[PDB]
């Protein structure tokens, strides 16, 4: 009955899955799909840009974390919690976490560890929803995400 968790896992897992496999899931999103569809479209636009602009930072972090199996995914959860340890929460940090998740998911697929992608998506969702639920709700959840990353075209 935790709709925020379900919706968050749907968006994050869909992005990690399509990034790792290179194939979009052509099923419609679950109900509340307008918001979820827009969020995944926004996440593609922003997340693809983050991975391209910051590939060097992402490759360096991946190389040092040495992610090989599902135990390393759990270790990554500890690190991800520290993304908010200074008391600051914003959508830039949240999308950076998800973007790195996609970056790692692509790595896991290349090393025949696709079974680790779903645990990775769940871990990212766990950190976001189980430790920053209150902030997410204040933003109107994924609607706030869509509206923040909406680039205004004002002629």
């Amino acid at each position: 009955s935790d709709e925020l968790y379900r919706q968050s896992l749907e968006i994050i897992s869909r992005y990690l899955r399509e990034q790792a496999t290179g194939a979009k899931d052509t099923k419609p999103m679950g109900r509340s799909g307008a918001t979820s569809r827009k969020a995944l479209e926004t996440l593609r636009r922003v997340g693809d840009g983050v991975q391209r602009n910051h590939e060097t930072a992402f490759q360096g972090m991946l190389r040092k974390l040495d992610i090989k199996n599902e135990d390393d995914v759990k270790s990554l959860s500890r690190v991800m919690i520290h993304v908010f340890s200074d008391g600051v929460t914003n959508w830039g940090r949240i999308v950076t976490l998800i973007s790195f998740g996609a970056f790692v998911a692509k790595h896991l697929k290349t090393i025949n560890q696709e079974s680790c992608i779903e645990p990775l998506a769940e871990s990212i969702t766990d950190v976001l929803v189980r430790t920053k639920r209150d902030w997410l709700v204040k933003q109107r959840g994924w609607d706030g995400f869509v509206e923040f990353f909406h680039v205004e075209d004002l002629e």
């Binding site: 983050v50 690190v79 991800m80 914003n90 959508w91 830039g92 999308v95 950076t96 976490l97 990353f149």
Partner: peptide
Amino acid sequence: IWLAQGARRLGDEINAYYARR
């Protein structure tokens, strides 16, 4: 976890980029 601040700073750069968008 020592790498944590790197993620925070990068995330803040991304937030700052879109905040003026």
